[PDB]
Ligand binder design. Structure first.
Ligand SMILES: Nc1ncnc2c1ncn2[C@H]1C[C@H](O)[C@@H](COP(=O)(O)NP(=O)(O)OP(=O)(O)O)O1
Ligand SMILES: [Mg+2]
Ligand SMILES: [Mg+2]
Length: 431
DNA sequence: CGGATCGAC
DNA sequence: CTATTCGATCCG
Protein backbone atom coordinates (compact mmCIF):
# COMPACT_ATOMS: atom_id res chain seq x y z
CA UNK A 1 0.00 0.00 0.00
CA UNK A 2 1.24 3.49 -1.03
CA UNK A 3 2.24 6.52 1.11
CA UNK A 4 -1.24 8.12 0.46
CA UNK A 5 -3.76 5.22 0.82
CA UNK A 6 -2.08 4.41 4.21
CA UNK A 7 -2.99 7.81 5.74
CA UNK A 8 -6.34 7.59 3.87
CA UNK A 9 -7.55 4.34 5.60
CA UNK A 10 -6.14 5.37 9.04
CA UNK A 11 -8.38 8.47 8.70
CA UNK A 12 -11.20 6.21 7.35
CA UNK A 13 -10.93 3.88 10.38
CA UNK A 14 -10.15 6.56 13.00
CA UNK A 15 -12.91 9.02 11.90
CA UNK A 16 -15.62 9.74 14.49
CA UNK A 17 -14.19 7.46 17.21
CA UNK A 18 -14.00 8.62 20.82
CA UNK A 19 -10.21 8.16 20.45
CA UNK A 20 -9.91 10.47 17.46
CA UNK A 21 -11.90 13.11 19.37
CA UNK A 22 -9.09 13.16 21.93
CA UNK A 23 -6.39 13.21 19.20
CA UNK A 24 -7.85 16.39 17.67
CA UNK A 25 -8.07 17.95 21.15
CA UNK A 26 -4.36 17.15 21.73
CA UNK A 27 -3.52 18.59 18.28
CA UNK A 28 -5.05 22.01 19.23
CA UNK A 29 -3.00 22.30 22.46
CA UNK A 30 0.11 21.67 20.31
CA UNK A 31 -0.88 24.15 17.57
CA UNK A 32 -1.77 26.72 20.25
CA UNK A 33 1.59 26.19 21.99
CA UNK A 34 3.17 26.76 18.54
CA UNK A 35 1.01 29.87 17.90
CA UNK A 36 2.20 31.22 21.28
CA UNK A 37 5.83 30.59 20.29
CA UNK A 38 5.31 32.49 16.98
CA UNK A 39 3.92 35.43 19.00
CA UNK A 40 7.24 35.48 20.89
CA UNK A 41 9.26 35.20 17.65
CA UNK A 42 7.44 38.27 16.27
CA UNK A 43 8.35 40.36 19.37
CA UNK A 44 12.06 39.41 19.53
CA UNK A 45 14.26 42.41 18.57
CA UNK A 46 17.51 42.53 16.57
CA UNK A 47 19.44 43.71 19.63
CA UNK A 48 18.22 40.68 21.66
CA UNK A 49 19.18 38.31 18.81
CA UNK A 50 22.76 39.71 18.71
CA UNK A 51 22.76 39.83 22.56
CA UNK A 52 22.07 36.05 22.62
CA UNK A 53 24.24 35.16 19.58
CA UNK A 54 27.24 36.20 21.73
CA UNK A 55 26.10 34.39 24.94
CA UNK A 56 25.29 31.14 23.04
CA UNK A 57 28.59 31.12 21.08
CA UNK A 58 30.50 31.73 24.33
CA UNK A 59 28.98 28.47 25.64
CA UNK A 60 29.37 26.73 22.23
CA UNK A 61 33.14 27.38 22.48
CA UNK A 62 33.05 25.96 26.05
CA UNK A 63 31.57 22.75 24.50
CA UNK A 64 33.71 22.69 21.33
CA UNK A 65 37.04 22.97 23.20
CA UNK A 66 36.11 20.04 25.48
CA UNK A 67 34.81 17.84 22.57
CA UNK A 68 35.87 14.19 23.00
CA UNK A 69 36.66 11.84 20.09
CA UNK A 70 38.85 9.38 22.02
CA UNK A 71 36.07 6.88 22.90
CA UNK A 72 34.46 4.24 20.67
CA UNK A 73 30.75 3.86 21.44
CA UNK A 74 28.64 1.13 19.88
CA UNK A 75 24.84 0.89 19.88
CA UNK A 76 23.39 -2.58 19.25
CA UNK A 77 19.73 -2.81 18.27
CA UNK A 78 17.85 -5.99 17.35
CA UNK A 79 15.89 -6.03 14.09
CA UNK A 80 12.11 -6.42 14.30
CA UNK A 81 12.79 -8.00 17.68
CA UNK A 82 9.56 -9.60 18.94
CA UNK A 83 8.61 -10.36 15.29
CA UNK A 84 12.00 -11.89 14.42
CA UNK A 85 11.77 -14.17 17.47
CA UNK A 86 8.30 -15.36 16.51
CA UNK A 87 9.34 -15.86 12.87
CA UNK A 88 12.45 -17.84 13.88
CA UNK A 89 10.44 -20.45 15.81
CA UNK A 90 7.46 -20.74 13.42
CA UNK A 91 8.75 -21.44 9.83
CA UNK A 92 5.30 -20.91 8.27
CA UNK A 93 5.41 -17.19 9.17
CA UNK A 94 8.66 -16.47 7.25
CA UNK A 95 8.10 -14.60 3.92
CA UNK A 96 4.78 -13.25 5.23
CA UNK A 97 3.61 -10.04 6.95
CA UNK A 98 3.38 -10.62 10.75
CA UNK A 99 2.95 -8.35 13.76
CA UNK A 100 3.33 -9.17 17.45
CA UNK A 101 0.33 -7.91 19.38
CA UNK A 102 -3.40 -8.23 19.86
CA UNK A 103 -6.28 -6.73 17.93
CA UNK A 104 -6.10 -3.83 20.45
CA UNK A 105 -2.39 -3.05 20.00
CA UNK A 106 0.80 -3.99 18.15
CA UNK A 107 4.19 -3.96 19.90
CA UNK A 108 5.98 -4.35 16.58
CA UNK A 109 5.85 -5.72 13.05
CA UNK A 110 8.33 -7.32 10.68
CA UNK A 111 9.72 -5.58 7.61
CA UNK A 112 7.40 -7.44 5.18
CA UNK A 113 4.42 -5.99 7.09
CA UNK A 114 5.96 -2.49 7.31
CA UNK A 115 5.69 -2.02 3.51
CA UNK A 116 1.88 -1.93 4.13
CA UNK A 117 2.39 0.80 6.78
CA UNK A 118 1.67 -1.43 9.85
CA UNK A 119 3.94 -0.34 12.72
CA UNK A 120 4.63 -0.29 16.43
CA UNK A 121 1.85 1.38 18.50
CA UNK A 122 -0.83 0.82 15.85
CA UNK A 123 -3.96 -1.05 16.95
CA UNK A 124 -4.56 -4.45 15.39
CA UNK A 125 -7.92 -3.74 13.70
CA UNK A 126 -6.45 -0.75 11.83
CA UNK A 127 -3.40 -2.83 10.78
CA UNK A 128 -5.83 -5.46 9.34
CA UNK A 129 -7.61 -2.86 7.15
CA UNK A 130 -4.13 -1.75 5.95
CA UNK A 131 -3.20 -5.38 5.14
CA UNK A 132 -5.77 -8.26 5.40
CA UNK A 133 -3.04 -10.95 4.99
CA UNK A 134 -1.47 -9.75 8.28
CA UNK A 135 -0.98 -12.54 10.81
CA UNK A 136 -1.18 -11.07 14.33
CA UNK A 137 0.59 -13.38 16.82
CA UNK A 138 0.54 -12.92 20.63
CA UNK A 139 3.68 -11.89 22.55
CA UNK A 140 5.77 -14.39 24.55
CA UNK A 141 7.69 -11.95 26.75
CA UNK A 142 9.56 -14.71 28.65
CA UNK A 143 11.14 -15.93 25.40
CA UNK A 144 12.04 -12.34 24.50
CA UNK A 145 13.53 -11.93 27.95
CA UNK A 146 15.47 -15.20 27.52
CA UNK A 147 16.72 -14.20 24.07
CA UNK A 148 17.85 -10.80 25.40
CA UNK A 149 19.84 -12.59 28.11
CA UNK A 150 21.62 -14.52 25.34
CA UNK A 151 22.81 -11.30 23.62
CA UNK A 152 23.80 -9.51 26.86
CA UNK A 153 26.15 -12.50 27.45
CA UNK A 154 28.00 -11.67 24.20
CA UNK A 155 28.00 -7.90 24.81
CA UNK A 156 29.58 -8.43 28.27
CA UNK A 157 32.79 -9.80 26.68
CA UNK A 158 33.46 -6.47 24.95
CA UNK A 159 32.28 -4.02 27.62
CA UNK A 160 31.46 -5.56 31.00
CA UNK A 161 30.02 -2.13 31.98
CA UNK A 162 27.65 -2.00 28.99
CA UNK A 163 24.27 -0.32 29.23
CA UNK A 164 21.19 -2.43 28.47
CA UNK A 165 18.65 0.26 27.54
CA UNK A 166 15.92 -2.31 26.90
CA UNK A 167 15.64 -6.01 26.00
CA UNK A 168 16.65 -5.44 22.38
CA UNK A 169 19.09 -2.48 22.80
CA UNK A 170 22.38 -1.64 24.50
CA UNK A 171 25.19 0.92 24.44
CA UNK A 172 28.78 -0.37 24.66
CA UNK A 173 32.07 1.39 25.24
CA UNK A 174 34.58 -0.81 23.40
CA UNK A 175 37.55 1.55 23.91
CA UNK A 176 39.29 -0.54 26.57
CA UNK A 177 38.61 -3.65 24.45
CA UNK A 178 39.94 -2.09 21.21
CA UNK A 179 43.30 -1.31 22.91
CA UNK A 180 43.51 -4.87 24.35
CA UNK A 181 42.43 -6.39 20.99
CA UNK A 182 45.19 -4.59 19.02
CA UNK A 183 47.78 -7.16 20.17
CA UNK A 184 45.72 -10.38 20.28
CA UNK A 185 46.52 -13.57 18.33
CA UNK A 186 44.05 -15.04 15.79
CA UNK A 187 43.12 -17.70 18.43
CA UNK A 188 41.46 -15.07 20.68
CA UNK A 189 39.23 -13.78 17.81
CA UNK A 190 38.24 -16.88 15.80
CA UNK A 191 34.63 -18.15 15.81
CA UNK A 192 33.05 -21.29 14.32
CA UNK A 193 29.87 -21.53 12.15
CA UNK A 194 26.72 -23.34 13.44
CA UNK A 195 34.17 -24.25 9.50
CA UNK A 196 36.07 -21.30 11.11
CA UNK A 197 36.24 -17.50 10.75
CA UNK A 198 38.43 -14.65 12.15
CA UNK A 199 37.64 -11.00 12.68
CA UNK A 200 40.03 -8.11 12.51
CA UNK A 201 41.52 -5.63 14.93
CA UNK A 202 39.35 -2.60 13.91
CA UNK A 203 36.16 -1.32 15.54
CA UNK A 204 34.15 -2.14 12.38
CA UNK A 205 35.46 -5.68 12.81
CA UNK A 206 34.67 -5.93 16.57
CA UNK A 207 31.08 -4.96 15.74
CA UNK A 208 31.04 -7.46 12.83
CA UNK A 209 32.14 -10.20 15.30
CA UNK A 210 29.43 -9.13 17.79
CA UNK A 211 26.73 -9.18 15.12
CA UNK A 212 28.06 -12.47 13.79
CA UNK A 213 28.04 -14.02 17.30
CA UNK A 214 24.50 -12.88 18.01
CA UNK A 215 23.39 -14.57 14.75
CA UNK A 216 25.04 -17.91 15.70
CA UNK A 217 23.64 -17.79 19.27
CA UNK A 218 20.11 -16.55 18.62
CA UNK A 219 19.50 -16.98 14.84
CA UNK A 220 18.53 -13.27 14.90
CA UNK A 221 20.00 -10.29 13.13
CA UNK A 222 20.88 -7.03 14.82
CA UNK A 223 22.06 -3.64 13.61
CA UNK A 224 24.79 -1.48 15.10
CA UNK A 225 26.13 2.10 15.13
CA UNK A 226 29.74 3.14 15.78
CA UNK A 227 30.64 6.72 16.75
CA UNK A 228 32.57 8.70 19.36
CA UNK A 229 29.44 9.31 21.53
CA UNK A 230 26.12 7.70 22.43
CA UNK A 231 23.91 10.27 20.66
CA UNK A 232 25.61 9.73 17.31
CA UNK A 233 25.91 5.94 17.72
CA UNK A 234 22.14 5.61 18.26
CA UNK A 235 21.48 7.40 14.95
CA UNK A 236 23.98 5.41 12.82
CA UNK A 237 22.48 2.24 14.37
CA UNK A 238 19.29 3.19 12.50
CA UNK A 239 21.23 4.08 9.30
CA UNK A 240 21.78 0.62 7.72
CA UNK A 241 18.97 -1.34 9.41
CA UNK A 242 18.19 -4.19 9.13
CA UNK A 243 21.30 -6.31 9.55
CA UNK A 244 23.94 -3.64 9.05
CA UNK A 245 26.38 -1.22 10.60
CA UNK A 246 27.70 2.27 10.20
CA UNK A 247 30.80 3.96 11.63
CA UNK A 248 31.29 7.68 12.08
CA UNK A 249 35.12 7.79 12.30
CA UNK A 250 36.62 9.73 15.25
CA UNK A 251 37.36 13.10 13.63
CA UNK A 252 35.44 16.39 13.81
CA UNK A 253 34.98 16.70 10.05
CA UNK A 254 33.38 13.24 9.68
CA UNK A 255 31.02 13.99 12.59
CA UNK A 256 29.88 17.25 10.98
CA UNK A 257 29.32 15.76 7.50
CA UNK A 258 26.97 13.17 9.07
CA UNK A 259 25.19 15.81 11.15
CA UNK A 260 25.01 18.32 8.23
CA UNK A 261 21.85 17.00 6.54
CA UNK A 262 20.49 14.86 9.39
CA UNK A 263 16.80 15.28 10.18
CA UNK A 264 16.40 16.17 13.89
CA UNK A 265 13.56 13.60 14.37
CA UNK A 266 16.06 10.73 14.02
CA UNK A 267 17.89 11.96 17.13
CA UNK A 268 16.75 10.08 20.23
CA UNK A 269 14.81 12.51 22.44
CA UNK A 270 13.51 14.72 19.63
CA UNK A 271 10.07 13.27 18.93
CA UNK A 272 6.84 14.01 17.09
CA UNK A 273 5.93 17.26 18.89
CA UNK A 274 9.38 18.93 19.04
CA UNK A 275 9.78 18.13 15.31
CA UNK A 276 6.52 19.95 14.49
CA UNK A 277 7.43 22.92 16.75
CA UNK A 278 10.95 23.36 15.36
CA UNK A 279 9.51 22.75 11.85
CA UNK A 280 7.30 25.84 12.35
CA UNK A 281 10.60 27.81 12.62
CA UNK A 282 11.86 26.22 9.36
CA UNK A 283 14.20 23.79 11.20
CA UNK A 284 14.23 20.26 9.77
CA UNK A 285 17.98 19.39 9.52
CA UNK A 286 20.70 19.66 12.19
CA UNK A 287 22.60 22.53 10.53
CA UNK A 288 19.42 24.61 10.68
CA UNK A 289 19.24 23.86 14.43
CA UNK A 290 22.75 25.38 14.61
CA UNK A 291 22.03 28.48 12.47
CA UNK A 292 19.01 29.38 14.61
CA UNK A 293 20.77 28.69 17.95
CA UNK A 294 20.45 32.28 19.17
CA UNK A 295 16.71 32.59 18.40
CA UNK A 296 16.29 29.21 20.15
CA UNK A 297 18.04 30.48 23.32
CA UNK A 298 15.19 32.99 23.77
CA UNK A 299 12.19 30.76 22.80
CA UNK A 300 13.29 27.71 24.87
CA UNK A 301 14.41 27.04 28.43
CA UNK A 302 18.09 26.70 29.36
CA UNK A 303 18.29 22.87 29.39
CA UNK A 304 16.21 22.61 26.18
CA UNK A 305 18.55 24.77 24.04
CA UNK A 306 21.56 23.35 25.94
CA UNK A 307 20.32 20.01 24.53
CA UNK A 308 19.68 21.44 21.01
CA UNK A 309 23.25 22.80 20.96
CA UNK A 310 24.71 19.38 21.83
CA UNK A 311 22.66 17.98 18.87
CA UNK A 312 23.85 20.69 16.48
CA UNK A 313 27.52 20.19 17.38
CA UNK A 314 27.23 16.35 17.12
CA UNK A 315 27.94 15.99 20.85
CA UNK A 316 26.60 13.57 23.45
CA UNK A 317 27.48 11.20 26.26
CA UNK A 318 30.98 9.59 26.05
CA UNK A 319 30.93 7.30 29.11
CA UNK A 320 28.13 4.96 30.18
CA UNK A 321 26.95 5.63 33.76
CA UNK A 322 25.98 2.22 35.27
CA UNK A 323 22.14 2.42 35.20
CA UNK A 324 21.01 4.25 38.39
CA UNK A 325 18.47 3.19 41.05
CA UNK A 326 14.77 3.67 40.20
CA UNK A 327 12.63 6.68 41.14
CA UNK A 328 9.21 5.03 40.82
CA UNK A 329 7.25 1.84 40.34
CA UNK A 330 3.77 1.47 38.84
CA UNK A 331 1.05 -0.74 37.47
CA UNK A 332 -1.93 0.09 35.28
CA UNK A 333 -4.56 -1.82 33.36
CA UNK A 334 -6.91 -1.19 30.44
CA UNK A 335 -10.36 -2.82 30.28
CA UNK A 336 -13.83 -2.60 28.80
CA UNK A 337 -15.78 0.06 30.69
CA UNK A 338 -16.03 0.11 34.46
CA UNK A 339 -18.49 2.57 36.07
CA UNK A 340 -19.95 1.18 39.33
CA UNK A 341 -18.10 2.83 42.22
CA UNK A 342 -17.63 -0.40 44.26
CA UNK A 343 -16.02 -2.17 41.26
CA UNK A 344 -13.56 0.73 40.80
CA UNK A 345 -12.48 0.51 44.43
CA UNK A 346 -12.14 -3.29 44.13
CA UNK A 347 -10.03 -2.76 41.01
CA UNK A 348 -7.85 -0.15 42.73
CA UNK A 349 -7.32 -2.48 45.73
CA UNK A 350 -6.16 -5.16 43.25
CA UNK A 351 -3.67 -2.77 41.63
CA UNK A 352 -2.42 -1.63 45.04
CA UNK A 353 -1.79 -5.32 45.85
CA UNK A 354 0.22 -6.03 42.67
CA UNK A 355 2.25 -2.86 43.25
CA UNK A 356 2.90 -4.01 46.85
CA UNK A 357 4.01 -7.46 45.63
CA UNK A 358 6.43 -5.80 43.15
CA UNK A 359 7.90 -3.51 45.84
CA UNK A 360 8.31 -6.64 47.99
CA UNK A 361 10.52 -8.19 45.27
CA UNK A 362 12.93 -5.20 45.20
CA UNK A 363 12.45 -4.11 48.89
CA UNK A 364 11.33 -0.51 48.31
CA UNK A 365 9.18 1.81 50.44
CA UNK A 366 7.91 5.13 49.04
CA UNK A 367 6.25 8.30 50.36
CA UNK A 368 4.15 9.38 47.34
CA UNK A 369 1.13 7.54 45.91
CA UNK A 370 -0.33 8.54 42.54
CA UNK A 371 -3.54 7.25 40.92
CA UNK A 372 -4.13 7.55 37.18
CA UNK A 373 -7.60 7.39 35.69
CA UNK A 374 -8.48 7.47 32.03
CA UNK A 375 -12.13 7.79 30.94
CA UNK A 376 -13.86 6.40 27.81
CA UNK A 377 -12.97 9.62 25.90
CA UNK A 378 -9.22 8.97 26.60
CA UNK A 379 -8.91 11.94 28.96
CA UNK A 380 -6.27 11.17 31.57
CA UNK A 381 -6.22 12.52 35.13
CA UNK A 382 -3.42 11.99 37.65
CA UNK A 383 -4.06 12.46 41.37
CA UNK A 384 -1.22 12.27 43.90
CA UNK A 385 -0.50 12.37 47.63
CA UNK A 386 2.73 12.47 49.65
CA UNK A 387 2.89 11.19 53.24
CA UNK A 388 5.29 11.64 56.22
CA UNK A 389 6.20 7.95 56.87
CA UNK A 390 7.06 5.58 53.96
CA UNK A 391 4.50 2.99 52.82
CA UNK A 392 4.81 -0.43 51.15
CA UNK A 393 2.04 -2.95 52.01
CA UNK A 394 -1.12 -3.41 49.91
CA UNK A 395 -3.27 -1.89 52.68
CA UNK A 396 -1.14 1.26 53.25
CA UNK A 397 -1.02 2.08 49.55
CA UNK A 398 -4.74 1.35 49.12
CA UNK A 399 -5.52 3.52 52.16
CA UNK A 400 -4.13 6.55 50.28
CA UNK A 401 -5.29 5.61 46.75
CA UNK A 402 -8.83 5.00 48.13
CA UNK A 403 -9.16 8.68 49.19
CA UNK A 404 -7.79 10.11 45.94
CA UNK A 405 -10.32 8.03 44.00
CA UNK A 406 -13.04 9.06 46.52
CA UNK A 407 -12.38 12.71 45.67
CA UNK A 408 -12.72 11.88 41.94
CA UNK A 409 -16.06 9.98 42.07
CA UNK A 410 -17.34 12.62 44.51
CA UNK A 411 -16.25 15.49 42.21
CA UNK A 412 -18.19 14.11 39.20
CA UNK A 413 -21.15 13.03 41.46
CA UNK A 414 -24.03 12.49 40.81
CA UNK A 415 -22.47 11.24 37.50
CA UNK A 416 -20.28 8.08 37.62
CA UNK A 417 -16.63 7.90 36.45
CA UNK A 418 -16.90 6.08 33.10
CA UNK A 419 -13.30 4.87 33.05
CA UNK A 420 -11.30 2.53 30.81
CA UNK A 421 -7.90 2.55 32.53
CA UNK A 422 -6.79 2.79 36.14
CA UNK A 423 -3.28 2.91 37.57
CA UNK A 424 -1.39 3.26 40.84
CA UNK A 425 2.22 4.53 41.00
CA UNK A 426 4.53 4.79 44.03
CA UNK A 427 7.45 7.26 44.18
CA UNK A 428 9.61 9.33 46.60
CA UNK A 429 11.94 6.52 47.68
CA UNK A 430 14.75 7.21 50.21
CA UNK A 431 18.37 8.34 49.52
C1' DC B 1 4.79 18.73 45.57
C1' DG B 2 0.95 17.94 41.94
C1' DG B 3 -0.23 17.62 37.44
C1' DA B 4 0.27 17.67 32.56
C1' DT B 5 3.26 16.56 28.51
C1' DC B 6 6.88 14.48 25.88
C1' DG B 7 9.58 10.54 24.49
C1' DA B 8 11.61 6.05 24.30
C1' DC B 9 10.78 0.57 23.73
C1' DC C 1 -15.91 -4.46 18.90
C1' DT C 2 -11.30 -2.67 19.23
C1' DA C 3 -6.03 2.84 20.35
C1' DT C 4 -0.88 -0.69 25.50
C1' DT C 5 6.36 1.40 32.61
C1' DC C 6 9.26 5.10 33.73
C1' DG C 7 12.39 9.05 33.67
C1' DA C 8 12.65 13.96 32.28
C1' DT C 9 11.06 18.49 32.15
C1' DC C 10 8.25 22.62 32.79
C1' DC C 11 5.15 25.32 35.28
C1' DG C 12 1.86 26.63 38.92
N1 LIG D 1 5.04 1.25 21.31
C1 LIG D 1 5.42 0.03 21.77
N2 LIG D 1 4.65 -0.63 22.67
C2 LIG D 1 5.03 -1.84 23.10
N3 LIG D 1 6.14 -2.52 22.76
C3 LIG D 1 6.89 -1.84 21.87
C4 LIG D 1 6.60 -0.59 21.35
N4 LIG D 1 7.61 -0.22 20.46
C5 LIG D 1 8.45 -1.23 20.49
N5 LIG D 1 8.08 -2.21 21.32
C6 LIG D 1 8.78 -3.50 21.56
C7 LIG D 1 8.61 -4.41 20.35
C8 LIG D 1 9.99 -4.46 19.70
O1 LIG D 1 10.27 -5.77 19.19
C9 LIG D 1 10.93 -4.09 20.83
C10 LIG D 1 12.14 -3.29 20.35
O2 LIG D 1 11.70 -2.00 19.94
P1 LIG D 1 12.27 -1.29 18.61
O3 LIG D 1 13.71 -1.52 18.50
O4 LIG D 1 11.89 0.22 18.68
N6 LIG D 1 11.50 -1.95 17.32
P2 LIG D 1 11.90 -3.32 16.54
O5 LIG D 1 13.14 -3.86 17.11
O6 LIG D 1 10.70 -4.40 16.65
O7 LIG D 1 12.22 -2.95 15.02
P3 LIG D 1 13.52 -2.19 14.47
O8 LIG D 1 14.38 -1.93 15.68
O9 LIG D 1 14.09 -3.13 13.44
O10 LIG D 1 13.01 -0.85 13.98
O11 LIG D 1 10.18 -3.29 21.75
MG1 LIG E 1 15.05 -2.91 17.52
MG1 LIG F 1 13.73 11.04 17.84
Amino acid sequence: LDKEKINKIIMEATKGSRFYGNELKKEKQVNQRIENMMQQKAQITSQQLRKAQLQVDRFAMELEQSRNLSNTIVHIDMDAFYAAVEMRDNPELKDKPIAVGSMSMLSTSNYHARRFGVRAAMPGFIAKRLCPQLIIVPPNFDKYRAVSKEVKEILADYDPNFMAMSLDEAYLNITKHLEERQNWPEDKRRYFIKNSVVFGTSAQEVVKEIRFRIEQKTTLTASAGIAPNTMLAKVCSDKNKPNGQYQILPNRQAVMDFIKDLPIRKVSGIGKVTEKMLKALGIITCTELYQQRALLSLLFSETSWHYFLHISLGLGSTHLTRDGERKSMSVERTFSEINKAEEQYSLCQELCSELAQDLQKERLKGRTVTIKLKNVNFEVKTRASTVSSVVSTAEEIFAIAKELLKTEIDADFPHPLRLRLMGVRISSFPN
